[PDB]
Amino acid sequence: MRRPTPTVYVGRVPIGGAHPIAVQSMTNTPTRDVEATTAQVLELHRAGSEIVRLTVNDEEAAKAVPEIKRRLLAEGAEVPLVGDFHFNGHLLLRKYPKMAEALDKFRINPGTLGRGRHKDEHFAEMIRIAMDLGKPVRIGANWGSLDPALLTELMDRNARRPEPKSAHEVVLEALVESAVRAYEAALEMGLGEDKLVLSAKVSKARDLVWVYRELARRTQAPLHLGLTEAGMGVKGIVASAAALAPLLLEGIGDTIRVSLTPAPGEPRTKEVEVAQEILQALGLRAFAPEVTSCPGCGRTTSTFFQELAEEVSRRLKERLPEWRARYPGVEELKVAVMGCVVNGPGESKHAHIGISLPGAGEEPKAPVYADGKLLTILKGEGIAEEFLRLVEDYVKTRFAP
Amino acid sequence: MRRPTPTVYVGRVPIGGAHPIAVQSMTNTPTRDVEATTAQVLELHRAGSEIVRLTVNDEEAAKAVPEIKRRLLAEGAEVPLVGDFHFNGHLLLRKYPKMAEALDKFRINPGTLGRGRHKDEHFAEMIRIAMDLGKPVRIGANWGSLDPALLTELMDRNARRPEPKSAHEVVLEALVESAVRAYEAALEMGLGEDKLVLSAKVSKARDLVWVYRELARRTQAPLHLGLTEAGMGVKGIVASAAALAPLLLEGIGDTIRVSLTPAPGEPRTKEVEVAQEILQALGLRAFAPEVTSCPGCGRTTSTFFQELAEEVSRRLKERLPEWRARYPGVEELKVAVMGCVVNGPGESKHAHIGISLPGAGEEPKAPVYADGKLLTILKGEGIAEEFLRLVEDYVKTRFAP
Ligand SMILES: C[C@@]1(CO)OP(=O)(O)OP(=O)(O)OC[C@H]1O
Ligand SMILES: C[C@@]1(CO)OP(=O)(O)OP(=O)(O)OC[C@H]1O
Ligand code: SF4
Ligand code: SF4
């Protein structure tokens, strides 16, 4: 099912149909602040961001990039950096060659190149720089910055149809056309297929699915997939997952970014967490152990069940750094915590290891299952720490080198 | 695209292809606690739960249901109640007819009916009760409680194939077969097509999509769709949305429930919120105004942007009760809050009303767009309260009766 694509290396990270779908993010510190940006790149990388983007918006930002890269390399952090260019990318890349060389990838937006004839020249200049330095490029369209000349073109084509489409449908058409035309122009200039990634983001899920299906049909490039401007909190999380899932299940998408608005004081790493959860939920990557647990209902005996589930989740997170170093494959661990006999044994048998608490009407004992069979039955006090010891014993055996 | 189905009324709430996809939830208080359960049914309903399920697990639970229903009706709360039966449903429904009459729907699990021959008799008894009272039924299979006799049957059929499938694939087959056979048996007994809903839940997203596609092909019934045992926190939210979205976009699903494990002390209403967000993200329902906002990046000028986005989201939530009463259609409101000129004007033009803050390099002014055109430009202090006044003025005009 995975769409075949050429491989594009973003630094040491390969993107494309033969490679795992890469998680990426973008900093939100001012790029001119070397200390703050370096720190956030590191933080994002440590959280799971395999590629990190930073805006390169003005001369002060450009001047900071080589120093950011130097500091990352000094700690052996080889996380690739993507520069995000708008309006003046051709000028910054021309004027600051050390910045152009320090970056691992350039992002161009076909709607933020300039006016009229200037747009093609600016484009060309950026692509020439990339070719000269052997850098990959993302041609990233976004409907928040759609090339107006292209929109008018397609509106006029639409108006000629026997059955014109809606204005909204035409905007989607223009967005795809913008990406596809810029992709083909870059190819025609001599930028290699191993150096082009495409995106074309919109902020509504159903629209994103239409767009990406069209991009995937009309191009061969690896695709950077994300729902732009997803918003805040649960809404932003849900919309992001709902938009990406249909496309990922159809084999479309080579790298993802989750565009969450942080709440004031919420860490910028949250979007990385959500990206990882999307991929893992769909079986496309394994990053860390996970917990399958029922909602609980009036059959569940006390607040113990919710406490135990949370304690297990916490413990897995705490053990992971050590486990990752010792036990190959542990990222695939699935642990169940269940509230009663209705689904508890059966769901637990589908995990690597699971506990079925006794709910209402049951004898006060908790069977524990591993590899689909009864392992033991726990009773009394301290069931949580007993179970967590059995999980540790399980991991040490199952994921032994 | 919506799959056509007969209409099944769950109380006053119609379920099926001609009706909006209904949000449902399940209580987690002990059903025997009348006060606690009534209160939680009300809370869930007020949060958006159009249908509420409660376990009816033992005689004490059964005895409480008529009193719960009576209390709800005394306040004019017509929220339909679904009784969740396992193991002893035939006995409780027989012994407590006032409970059977008080419920609006019975849920049966074909894997929790009993042993051997007893399973068909128990089934039949429950279906007979439902027919006698004119109640609808959900036949709800779950792979945590899969009928073992059916699994063996299908394992033996599998073993005879020239190319047997995996054990995991056979479990999925058995789950679908369990639901389909019980559905057909209920039809054959004389339960009407206007009285049968089906589910067949699994805890892994990709599996849920396979299962529901099969259920949808093989049956005509409205389908209750949910990812069972989704787990806690962001993982549970993401997995739920990722599993449901592909199916909802294909037109499959007539009611949903989100199976989140609450954190200790987290309200049971969170699953309702997530369910609403799934449906609204996909354009299938509109419950309340929403905010489209960028992630912010190093182009964004201060923590003001995140604060403003959050303030707008909060204000919309606070205004909604009044707005819903005054202004028809307001649930469809889309408001944008954007961090800079790159995408700010364009995204704002796609909302009903939006603000584009000035980011780095820009003059300290914030254009505001409404209905796709410039409405005003804000400057100075108090931009948040000015914008929120313009949102109020907008709503009063656009959503006027
Ligand atoms: C930074 C921007 C600029 O176009 O990048 P995109 O890749 O278009 O989209 P997203 O990742 O949602 O980030 C916000 C955008 O403003
Ligand atoms: C209550 C149970 C019982 O089978 O209901 P289902 O509808 O099978 O699934 P879900 O809504 O995930 O709730 C948990 C289950 O244990
Ligand atoms: S497994 Fe038991 S306690 Fe958990 S939600 Fe299902 S019926 Fe309730
Ligand atoms: S709209 Fe501007 S501030 Fe917001 S993420 Fe995009 S480039 Fe950054």
Transcribe A253-308 into DSSP letters.
-SEEE--EEPPTT--TTHHHHHHHHHHHHTTS---S-EEEE----TTS-STHHHHH
Distance A190 CA to ligand 4 centre (A): 30
Asked whether the beta carbons of residue A298 and residue B264 sit closer than 8 angstroms, the reply is no
Say if residues A267 and A35 touch (Cβ distance below 8 Å): no
B256 and B140 within one domain: yes
Say if residues B321 and B345 touch (Cβ distance below 8 Å): no
Closest alpha carbon to B226 in B206, B256, B265: B256
Chain B hits for A230, CB-CB cut-off 8 Å, are 292, 295
Q: Which residues contact A29 (CB under 8 A, 6 or more apart)?
A: A36, A37, A39, A40, B298
Q: Which residues contact B331 (CB under 8 A, 6 or more apart)?
A: B286, B287, B288, B289, B324
A258 and A161 within one domain: yes
Chain B: residue whose CA lies nearest to A356 = B144
Q: Domains in chain B: how many in total? A: 2
- Establish if A61 touches chain B: CB-CB under 8 angstroms: yes
- CA pseudo-torsion sign B336, B341, B345, B350: negative
- CA pseudo-torsion sign A145, A150, A155, A158: negative
A237 and A331 within one domain: no
Asked whether the beta carbons of residue A298 and residue B259 sit closer than 8 angstroms, the reply is no
**Looking at this protein, which amino acid is placed at residue B114?**
G
Q: Give binding residues of A for [4Fe-4S] cluster as ranges.
A: 294, 297, 340, 347
In order of A208, A299, A372, B122, B137, the CA distances from B85 in angstroms are 41, 11, 26, 11, 11
Chain A hits for B228, CB-CB cut-off 8 Å, are 294, 343, 347
Closest alpha carbon to B388 in B322, B309, B294, B321: B309
B292 and B267 within one domain: no
Q: Helix A167-189 and helix A148-159: axis angle, to 10°? A: 120
> Among residues A256, A285, A314, which one ends one of the domains?
A285
Say if residues B73 and B42 touch (Cβ distance below 8 Å): no
Asked whether the beta carbons of residue B146 and residue A346 sit closer than 8 angstroms, the reply is yes
- The DSSP code sequence of B201-262 is E-SSHHHHHHHHHHHHHH--S-BEE--TT-EEHHHHHHHHHHHHHHHHHTT--SEEE--EEP
Asked whether the beta carbons of residue A233 and residue B303 sit closer than 8 angstroms, the reply is no
Say if residues B366 and B386 touch (Cβ distance below 8 Å): no
Q: For a substitution probing ligand 3, which of A301, A304, A340 has the most ligand atoms within 8 Å of its CB?
A: A340
Coil/strand/helix, residue A155: helix
What is the spatial distance between Cα A395 and Cα A352, in angstroms, rounded to a whole number?
9
B299 and B234 within one domain: no
Q: Which residues pair with A335 in a beta bridge?
A: A291, A353
Tell which B residues from 240 to 279 touch A, by Cβ distance under 8 Å: 241-246, 249, 259-264, 271, 273-274, 277-278
Which among A297, A313, A337, A348 is the top mutation candidate for probing chain B, defined by the most B β-carbons within 10 Å of its own β-carbon?
A297
Q: Give binding residues of B for [4Fe-4S] cluster as ranges.
A: 294, 297, 340, 347
Closest alpha carbon to B226 in B210, B212, B215: B212
Q: Which residues pair with B24 in a beta bridge?
A: B51, B257
What is the spatial distance between Cα A240 and Cα A323, in angstroms, rounded to a whole number?
30
Instruction: Say which CATH number the domain at B159 has.
Output: 3.20.20.20
A173 and A69 within one domain: yes
Q: Counting every residue, how long is chain B?
A: 401
Report the Cα B199 to chain-centroid distance in Å.
13
Closest alpha carbon to B347 in A85, A170, A260, A228: A228
DSSP A223: B
Say if residues B205 and A281 touch (Cβ distance below 8 Å): yes
Q: Burial of B21 by CB count in 10 Å (0-12 exposed, 13-18 middle, 19+ buried)?
A: buried
Instruction: Say which CATH number the domain at B345 has.
Output: 3.30.413.10
- Reported as type and span, the H/E element at residue B14 is strand B13-15
Report the Cα B386 to chain-centroid distance in Å.
36
DSSP B263: P
- Which structural domain, as residue segments, surrounds residue B66? 1-285
Q: Is the CB of B222 under 6 A from ligand 4?
A: no
- CA pseudo-torsion sign B362, B363, B366, B372: negative
Question: Could you tell me the two tokens for B1?
Answer: 């695209």
What is the spatial distance between Cα B260 and Cα B236, in angstroms, rounded to a whole number?
6
Q: Burial of B74 by CB count in 10 Å (0-12 exposed, 13-18 middle, 19+ buried)?
A: exposed
Distance A229 CA to ligand 4 centre (A): 9
> Among residues A285, A313, A329, which one ends one of the domains?
A285
> Among residues B233, B250, B285, which one ends one of the domains?
B285
What are the φ/ψ torsions at residue B257 (nearest 5 degrees)? Answer: -140, 135
Q: What resolution, expressed in A, was reported for this entry?
A: 1.4
**Looking at this protein, which amino acid is placed at residue A360?**
A
Say if residues B236 and A276 touch (Cβ distance below 8 Å): no
Asked whether the beta carbons of residue A295 and residue B261 sit closer than 8 angstroms, the reply is yes
B31 and B146 within one domain: yes
B11 and B115 within one domain: yes
Q: Kindly identify the ligand whose nearest atom is closest to the C-alpha of B296.
A: 4
B102 and B178 within one domain: yes
A99 and A34 within one domain: yes
Coil/strand/helix, residue B6: coil
Question: Could you tell me the two tokens for B250?
Answer: 């294909």
Strands (E), B323-372: 334-338, 353-356, 366-370
Which among A151, A343, A356 is the top mutation candidate for probing chain B, defined by the most B β-carbons within 10 Å of its own β-carbon?
A343
Say if residues B360 and B369 touch (Cβ distance below 8 Å): no
What is the spatial distance between Cα B356 and Cα B341, in angstroms, rounded to a whole number?
7
Say if residues B79 and B72 touch (Cβ distance below 8 Å): yes
Asked whether the beta carbons of residue A295 and residue B204 sit closer than 8 angstroms, the reply is no
- The DSSP code sequence of B139-194 is EEEEGGG--HHHHHHHHHHHHTSSSPPPHHHHHHHHHHHHHHHHHHHHHHHT--GG
In order of A179, A192, B255, the CA distances from A368 in angstroms are 53, 55, 33
What is the spatial distance between Cα A272 and Cα A254, in angstroms, rounded to a whole number?
16
What is the spatial distance between Cα B359 and Cα A225, in angstroms, rounded to a whole number?
25
Q: Burial of B390 by CB count in 10 Å (0-12 exposed, 13-18 middle, 19+ buried)?
A: middle
Question: Could you tell me the two tokens for B110?
Answer: 């074909």
Question: Could you tell me the two tokens for B358?
Answer: 């000035």
The DSSP bridge pattern shows strands A366-370 and A373-378 to be antiparallel
DSSP A20: P
Distance from CA of A36 to the nearest CA of B (A): 11
B359 and B279 within one domain: no
Coil/strand/helix, residue B82: strand
Report the Cα B361 to chain-centroid distance in Å.
45
- Reported as type and span, the H/E element at residue A181 is helix A167-189
- Count other Cβ atoms within 10 Å, centred on residue B365: 13
A61 and A41 within one domain: yes
Q: How was this structure determined?
A: X-ray
In order of A247, A354, B67, B382, the CA distances from B264 in angstroms are 34, 20, 28, 39
